[PDB]
Amino acid sequence: SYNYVVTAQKPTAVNGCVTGHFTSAEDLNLLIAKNTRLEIYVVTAEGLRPVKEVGMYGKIAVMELFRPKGESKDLLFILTAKYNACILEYKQSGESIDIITRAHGNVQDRIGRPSETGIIGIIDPECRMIGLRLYDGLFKVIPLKELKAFNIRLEELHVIDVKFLYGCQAPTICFVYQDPQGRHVKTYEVSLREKEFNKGPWKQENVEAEASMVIAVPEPFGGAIIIGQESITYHNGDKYLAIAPPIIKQSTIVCHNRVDPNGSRYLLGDMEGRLFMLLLLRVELLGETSIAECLTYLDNGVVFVGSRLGDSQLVKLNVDSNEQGSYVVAMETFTNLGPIVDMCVVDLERQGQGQLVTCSGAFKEGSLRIIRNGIGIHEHASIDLPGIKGLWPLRSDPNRETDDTLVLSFVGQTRVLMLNGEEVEETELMGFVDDQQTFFCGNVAHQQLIQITSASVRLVSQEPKALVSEWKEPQAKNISVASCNSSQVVVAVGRALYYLQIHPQELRQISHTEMEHEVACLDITPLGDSNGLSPLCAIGLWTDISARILKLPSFELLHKEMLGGEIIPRSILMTTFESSHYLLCALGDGALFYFGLNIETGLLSDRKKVTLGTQPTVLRTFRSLSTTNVFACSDRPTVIYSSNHKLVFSNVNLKEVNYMCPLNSDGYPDSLALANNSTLTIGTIDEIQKLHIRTVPLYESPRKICYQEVSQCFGVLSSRIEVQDTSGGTTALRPSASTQALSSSVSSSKLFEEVEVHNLLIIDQHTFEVLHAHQFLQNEYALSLVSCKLGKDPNTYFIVGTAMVYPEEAEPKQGRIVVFQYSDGKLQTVAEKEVKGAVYSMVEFNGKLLASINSTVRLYEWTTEKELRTECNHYNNIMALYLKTKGDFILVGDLMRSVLLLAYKPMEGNFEEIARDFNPNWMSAVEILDDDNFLGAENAFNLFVCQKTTDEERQHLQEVGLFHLGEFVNVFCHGSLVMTPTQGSVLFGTVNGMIGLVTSLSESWYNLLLDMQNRLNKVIKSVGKIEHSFWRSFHTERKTEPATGFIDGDLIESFLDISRPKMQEVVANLQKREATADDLIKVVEELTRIH
Amino acid sequence: MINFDTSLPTSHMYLGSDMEEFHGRTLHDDDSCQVIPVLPHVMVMLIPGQTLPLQLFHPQEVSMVRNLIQKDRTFAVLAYSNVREREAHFGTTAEIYAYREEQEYGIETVKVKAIGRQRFKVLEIRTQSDGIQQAKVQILPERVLPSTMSAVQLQSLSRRHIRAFRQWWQKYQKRKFHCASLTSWPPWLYSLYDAETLMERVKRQLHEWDENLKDESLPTNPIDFSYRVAACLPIDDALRIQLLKIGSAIQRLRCELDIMNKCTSLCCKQCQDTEITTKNEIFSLSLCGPMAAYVNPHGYIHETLTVYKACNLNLSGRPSTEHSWFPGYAWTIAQCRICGNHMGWKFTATKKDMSPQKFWGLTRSALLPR
């Protein structure tokens, strides 16, 4: 087996964030770490300015800015989880932006135990060094080219937190540490000139038993602020100030930030999303935010809440409290899918069009996320007008800036609609003809309007509406093709072309030409800083099938591209994306050619072909969020946009669009008028991006998810934290999904401070409303969930596997398997089977129920009497956490990678142990790929693939795939978000909100791409200069082995992004059979279509 | 309460004091291949960290070890799958730590004290003309895994360090495994794989056996801890090999807890249904646990389990103090009442003031936890 792995969605969760002056010493910057990604911004004061996004060959652990003495801007230090260290400088020269490495090296030690409190990366205030706490009993020092490092024997093994002390003659580090006596704060002076530690400026003062963080406070204060569970204490030798506020007792303070540069105010954040102000000691609760991983104070009053459990935020710290009393007000919300704890692919809306519903976030940030490929439209009006052949917006009032008129074209007719606010009405625009089909009309030069029909070119004045000019072909012939801007008109009469200028009360005929063949399409869009006057005319011709760039007024040929074929070009368009000029040309077969266009020479370069639909594509230009795009109307409506000076094509979620135009009226602002075969719809376009994310906040923890088609609803296992009230039970913390159910129910017992309450939610696949919530038993922990049909029975049942969890018990002694029927908007309990353990996993096994009970694996038969009956059992000696199946072939998994394969013998009515493998490593997920292979997630963010004459050979599984992903996979799922080169499709959901895709490749296709990877890596410049081979190397604390049987799709996809001479370099002598760059463009393009 | 010195058995005083002590440690690289000698008359399974006492008198064995002292000091102890057809696929290396040569009765004799070091995978057993065998072996590495939460937590929550202490353990679970909410498994599931947790669960049983136990005597490291506990569980040979195969201290502790919980009655291996003692009668009279390996005057190693009460036993002959493994106690031969199988011995105090006044030394080869 040979597999291909690619990122469908980048990590969303925020790992860290900083503020400084990285770009220029003027611009205030916000650097956000999204694991393998680094987003760089400027504080707009009126928003957030997105400057650059750089990917990396490592997981960011440390990220801290610094300015050592004289510097034009800031230097950034980054340390990866694989101990890759680098200093990065920003470099900008026009539209070309590049992150530059200043120093780099691997700081990892040959020996040592990686510390329990994680990697700690501190920096001296004077920029004299880098302090790293990666291993217990050592303090690594990097004095800030090859990042030369050295260790110091740090006596106190268990360091909680550490910071570099401000205002010190000799650099000092203050650290909270624990020993058998207690937990104490200590100081040490780090000497570079002696390469050792010497006694700190002050005594080892005893701190809180649960002291968690050291906050180095700047001058004139100095010293440190130790934070604990109940207390906040300050130390400066002989200076002490111990405070114990009750307001911070509920939750532990997890993060902080400096508000005043002197150190008078600090932001504090707990695990429950409460925001505090530590004033200089006094603490005041500001308000509620998302559960902050990191906090950042920027500009005046605005705060960045970097959340890993929920959507990240921009919030305002007001001086005056609102009616509720909150000094915190939310401005902007940033979608975070992480953590994806479970997911499923469901054909909601259209069949073939797969959607991904995830169990995202945790606690109050718990949500459902629906991820669908393609941009959507928000319908505000819908009108029955079949057979629209054209759409144009008009401003019938020159004094108004908004479109108040919509002009429609039909077979041989023209209808005019007026927009009186939200009211669309049929009218007749004076001067315009209704008995002729329109090819163009719009607002033109000198407060006039134009209408180009099959018969003439009509020029109408706006005050009053009347015909001021009219142009016709001299032999009264019909206009075949027409193009018009604000000052110019170019019309075709078969082979003839005519160039007109729009003057006051005059349509002036400037020039004319005869073409080699019949004219098919025309475009005279003015590009660049051309004040509504285009010196270029784009033209598509019949028979020769050519795209030609002509000069105005001469009609001189500048360029002639031979598109090739028997299919005539239907639509032609000149456009500008990210200041780069392009020529788009659509053929009658739905194929689209797109070239870059030189405005001066007329040269069409970088020919690229894309298959959009089956029908001829119509290209219309529209504006969205102050950015120019192109709507490609066909049976697969598409938006053509620019991302990193490369054209992107995202699908529209509409069956088909024939024609469209942008409408900006008083009633429909910044809208899109779309037309298909039967109706006209006015609406608003979504975010112009590849995927769309619908958020269904639950305000509790979603754990598991499955889908029942026969019920048109999803089954969701969820849990809510409740506190022990001064009554015989518990009370909620806030309203959540399980509390606010349409219809509620609870489990009836038949089996013998903060509590977790478990529920089975029922959610409608359209509205996403909690139709029903079934609360489980007290102390009953719901683990597994499956929506299937069992035995001879034709009813689909929602089945749940539970465990009775008690603090005294370590391994659940009890559990249930509960069969539910969802009828009449209420769950009816069909069967309740009590088992002697935890039901970690359940799977529908060929009309039977396969379910794990602790170590044992059970097969249940569903009788006519409607109750599960024990068939056969397999006692494993290994916990049956993972239970996956395909036919009579069963996979059994342990959290320690102990896999064993079972087979159900039908005639024997027993289980047979095919093969086993026991190689301890933490395993987070597993999925069967095919008959002989299976995929899994292994410790240190890796992926693996195990495969299947002698018995001591056949009874043993072999590890064929090893790959360092850089992500923690919680779920694998068979499905696709897309409507052959590769075999199969498995999607995966991670902790960081990253979604990925795994597909199989052929032996030679794998070798082709592997060879290509080695060649790409010689061309591609790596951020921080990390070797890709090293990054992808299967890594553990023990061994680091190169990646095997896996292709980095993300690396393969960057071939389409490298320079064209660099593509030539990569493909040169690549291959035995030879490979053209054109062959490799098609192969790589084909692979981008899987996601 | 017990007044016997629990340290006394571990020193093997019967072997005699005044032994040449060796300090220097030899350790082979992981997965590395080695050719180690095998002592022909050793038939016991040795767990790493376990003390193996020997009394060698066969000339070929005496010369073997005498030469072994001049170098490596390590030999191979084979974990026989079938002791009759002398088949072994696994084993443990034994390093001599105490050594003494004597000459008596026309023979040259040597008494050694070795310790288990490294488990291995048998690749080929070659035999020498003198009788003693060599073994081409592959050193099996000890697999150490990080915290279950180590990978998932690369965040702010990192710096949350680990009667009435019952609530500490609950606060510990809630805290250490808080990040389980980012994963697809509960904190109570991660506990089932936590070394500290699994160890405190074992330490619970160890304190039921040694009522006078001080935690300082126990190893802190789960690697040394899983092995110490492995060596004092009175289990059958098939189950013992299964335990020796285990690479992880976690998989080992989990195994030991399962054995400990399912263990109830200890019967006579021969008649199988005759109950001799129960889990409740086991107690640690030695620091190395309730069960330990000792040598008789003829070099035969008996792994003996200390229990207070035994049931279907018949004694024969009068007590003796000759070569006693528990100084201050006399032994008398004990056999199964039903079949006559030699089950071990009854130990009785030689002084009126001693506590326990009597106990039972049962050999594990005679027992069956059935």
Ligand SMILES: Nc1cccc2c1C(=O)N([C@H]1CCC(=O)NC1=O)C2=O
């Ligand atoms: N003197 C002999 C002679 C033959 C067999 C044994 C002994 C002997 O002393 N032990 C045990 C009895 C119990 C003991 O404490 N130490 C031993 O060596 C034997 O199996």
Ligand SMILES: [Zn+2]
């Ligand atoms: Zn018997």
